[PDB]
Amino acid sequence: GPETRPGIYVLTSSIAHWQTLVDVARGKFARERCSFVNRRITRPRQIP
Amino acid sequence: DRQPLNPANIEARHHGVSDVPRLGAMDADEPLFVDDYRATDDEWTLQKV
Amino acid sequence: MSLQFIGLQRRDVVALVNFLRHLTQKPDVDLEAHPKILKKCGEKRLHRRTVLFNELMLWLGYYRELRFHNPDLSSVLEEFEVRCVAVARRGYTYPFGDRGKARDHLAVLDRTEFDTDVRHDAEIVERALVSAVILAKMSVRETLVTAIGQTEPIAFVHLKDTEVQRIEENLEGVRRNMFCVKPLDLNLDRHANTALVNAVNKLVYTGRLIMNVRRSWEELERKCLARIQERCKLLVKELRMCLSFDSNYCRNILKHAVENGDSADTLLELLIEDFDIYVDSFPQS
Amino acid sequence: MSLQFIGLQRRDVVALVNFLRHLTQKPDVDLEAHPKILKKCGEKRLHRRTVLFNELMLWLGYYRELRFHNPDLSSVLEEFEVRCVAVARRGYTYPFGDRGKARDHLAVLDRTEFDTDVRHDAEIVERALVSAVILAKMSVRETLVTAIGQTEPIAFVHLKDTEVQRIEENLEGVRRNMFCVKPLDLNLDRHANTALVNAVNKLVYTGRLIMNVRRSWEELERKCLARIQERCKLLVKELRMCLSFDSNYCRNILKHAVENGDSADTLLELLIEDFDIYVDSFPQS
Amino acid sequence: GLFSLDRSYEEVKAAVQQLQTITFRDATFTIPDPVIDQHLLIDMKTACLSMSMVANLASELTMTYVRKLALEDSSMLLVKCQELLMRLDRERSVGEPRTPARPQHVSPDDEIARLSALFVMLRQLDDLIREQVVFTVCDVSPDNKSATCIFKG
């Protein structure tokens, strides 16, 4: 609501190609990803 | 018949009063007739036994 | 502006004027549904010319009253839109054997609307009920049609065969009497049926109530025109049989096209305002 | 074609049928709200069998009119879901001192939907109202009850005490006369209040308006069945007191279960069509 | 370029003047208008339409693809994605098209071509989408006359 509260991460990984790299992140961070779309339908004019 | 009996409007019965429409409904596949359930799930199991 | 007649007695005029004031209240709204009104014209009793004029006054007055009362069913049409949305919302909580196949019939039902063009309404209710009646079959697990080109005809589901015979009699009267609808005494709601199915059965009756009116109004409004167009093919030839100023003046009155009822209204009031001059053209008494 | 009666005078017969034709117009609809109508049945003054039978023609005719009308919720209940979703957007906008507490209520409110079963609908609304009224206190940080098992009662927040009486008073009419709704022209909006608060007031008002139509309906539909079943426990024993063709004939009629209202309509339609054969059994005049 | 068409209204006439004047650290600058003599240059028209295609062709085409993939409820967000397409701000009441509008009566082959017409606009648009780095400065000389920069790309 009032503000984003970002976290920080450092991720060693055997993956090198950018396409396969982001795909695994789409799973582990799907919880925040659900918050991302949820804020969009919640707050028009606001553009996270 | 090929059509399901699922709607409940097809089923109705009566006792002790003259039923020309029911007695004339004989042999015809529909409407078919089923009595109000004296049956219970425990007694229903025994008929299969 | 009131209808005029030639040789008719005043008692016959009372029979006709009362028919217009009571035309909505009278069962079965059709001039051919009341043959005795045609007997008031005095056909065969009088000359062939006089019968053609009095009949024209009847059909134009039978037509103008339909233009007056105006089947404004838009109020009842709004109720069909509300009961339509009531059906689809119930189905989201009920699992089906193929949720994607069911949702395709839901989304089309939720797009329902009524454009200003009246001609679409015959197709609006039809395309909606086909998305609705098939949806009721899925919850009951009754087989739906699979062959191409074999859309299911609309019909009430989960009702006694005696009950369908009763409600059809009520829709049968609306086809003959589109004005004063009389509500049924046998409600379609049933405790035995799934509550969504009762929303569908009322949705069909709201659909049949509207489609019968738009269809019957499409016929009688068109049927009156052909009955009037024959008079131009008849009354004009009778004026050709004898030439006099009264017989000649009527020939130009019929020059207006019967087509388009707005132009046809000019054919009536102009015929009435000038009635005094050609009254002698038709023999009487 | 119409409900039958035994010893009633013709003036009493028309008076009862008119009570059903005007039943929605009469304030505070209940058979016990009009005690004199039970005196019109012929209590005490007539033979005891005549009273029990005519009362059976009342409750079966009273319950049948309830099916014939049935308080539709297709209009306001859809408006309730829209105003409910509107609260879900405004609820996220307001900062809280405990983000995890307000999320627990709004996550439940987002999932609101109506099952096809109608009896569960009162449970649907109340879980959304308790979720909302608890949130309304957090907007002003008023102390909600913390005791386990107490369950905070539904109540409007931050309104004039006279307005709190006017708003609840209309619900008392919804709990008595559910048919002819006459919504208040008064606004629930308060410019001094947060828009999140006023949205709850429009939400709780419709939320009480939905449950009150259902609970008062379920209170009648449940009561109507038990009142008929008590007549069967007594009237059948009276037929046992004197064996006869018509007396044993009636025993078969009541043999069918009173359960389910669809059966009750079948119980009435047969009893009227065959009423003539056994009318002699009941003394009158 | 989105405002290259409308111009007579004062609101657009001023809003372009604000975008024309960038303001940043130290010196400020002004960005020349691509538009000249009312009519737009062909390059911006090819680019502005490339966004206009994706902004509109994506609308109807994505409707069928959301409803089917959302049935799994895996990440659950796809159900919220289905209502994302209604495109509105105010909580609209009882107009009764709560579901997003969907394509109808599309030709079975032309539906494939519409997807081919989609991504091809993205390829023409791609040059504006990205900015490859070419240098990364480290230390900077005084008066900013020059600076060392490791090469990139």
From Swiss-Prot, chain A:
Compartments in which it is found: Virion; Host nucleus
Protein name per Swiss-Prot or TrEMBL: Triplex capsid protein 1
Transmembrane regions listed in the UniProt entry: none
Boundaries of the shown chain within the full protein: 195 to 242 of 290
Function as written in the Swiss-Prot or TrEMBL entry: Structural component of the T=16 icosahedral capsid. The capsid is composed of pentamers and hexamers of major capsid protein/MCP, which are linked together by heterotrimers called triplexes. These triplexes are formed by a single molecule of triplex protein 1/TRX1 and two copies of triplex protein 2/TRX2. Additionally, TRX1 is required for efficient transport of TRX2 to the nucleus, which is the site of capsid assembly.
Subunit structure as annotated in this protein's UniProt entry: Interacts with TRX2, MCP and capsid vertex component 2/CVC2.
Family affiliation: Belongs to the herpesviridae TRX1 protein family.
UniProtKB/Swiss-Prot annotation, chain B:
Domain of life: Viruses
Location in or out of the cell: Virion; Host nucleus
Coiled coil: none
Family per similarity comment: Belongs to the herpesviridae major capsid protein family.
Function: Self-assembles to form an icosahedral capsid with a T=16 symmetry, about 200 nm in diameter, and consisting of 150 hexons and 12 pentons (total of 162 capsomers). Hexons form the edges and faces of the capsid and are each composed of six MCP molecules. In contrast, one penton is found at each of the 12 vertices. Eleven of the pentons are MCP pentamers, while the last vertex is occupied by the portal complex.
Assembly and binders: Homomultimer. Makes the hexons and eleven out of twelve pentons. Interacts with triplex proteins 1/TRX1 and 2/TRX2; adjacent capsomers are linked together in groups of three by triplexes, heterotrimeric complexes composed of one molecule of TRX1 and two molecules of TRX2. Interacts with scaffold protein; this interaction allows efficient MCP transport to the host nucleus. Interacts with capsid vertex component 2/CVC2. Interacts with the small capsomere-interacting protein/SCP.
Annotated protein name in UniProt: Major capsid protein
Region of the whole protein represented: 735 to 783 of 1370
UniProtKB/Swiss-Prot annotation, chains C, D:
Species of origin: Human cytomegalovirus (strain AD169)
UniProt keyword annotations, A-Z: Glycoprotein, Host cytoplasm, Host nucleus, Host-virus interaction, Phosphoprotein, Virion, Virion tegument
Gene field: UL32
Family: Belongs to the herpesviridae large structural phosphoprotein family.
Taxonomic superkingdom: Viruses
Location, primary (coarse class): virion
GO MF assignments: structural molecule activity
Taxon lineage: Viruses, Duplodnaviria, Heunggongvirae, Peploviricota, Herviviricetes
UniProt GO cellular component terms: host cell cytoplasmic vesicle; host cell nucleus; host cell perinuclear region of cytoplasm; host cell viral assembly compartment; viral tegument
Post-translational modification: Phosphorylated by host CCNA2.
Described function: Participates in the last steps of viral maturation and release. Associates with nuclear capsids prior to DNA encapsidation and later preserves the integrity of nucleocapsids through secondary envelopment at the assembly compartment. Interacts with host CCNA2 and thereby blocks the onset of lytic gene expression to promote establishment of a quiescent state of infection in undifferentiated cells.
Residues of the whole record sequence present: 1 to 285 of 1048
Quaternary data: Interacts with host BICD1 and RAB6A. Interacts with small capsid protein UL48A; this interaction links together the capsid and pp150. Interacts with host CCNA2.
Protein location: Virion tegument; Host cytoplasm; Host nucleus
Keyword RNA-binding: no
Protein name, UniProt field: Large structural phosphoprotein
Curated annotation (Swiss-Prot), chain E:
GO molecular function: structural molecule activity
GO CC list: host cell nucleus; viral capsid
Primary location recorded for the protein, binned into one broad class: virion
Entry keywords, A to Z: Capsid protein, Host nucleus, Virion
SS bonds (residue pairs): none
Localization per Swiss-Prot or TrEMBL: Virion; Host nucleus
Function: Structural component of the T=16 icosahedral capsid. The capsid is composed of pentamers and hexamers of major capsid protein/MCP, which are linked together by heterotrimers called triplexes. These triplexes are formed by a single molecule of triplex protein 1/TRX1 and two copies of triplex protein 2/TRX2. Additionally, TRX1 is required for efficient transport of TRX2 to the nucleus, which is the site of capsid assembly.
Family recorded in the similarity comment: Belongs to the herpesviridae TRX2 protein family.
Subunit note: Interacts with TRX1 and major capisd protein/MCP.
Protein name according to UniProt: Triplex capsid protein 2
Protein's organism: Human cytomegalovirus (strain AD169)
Gene that encodes the chain: TRX2
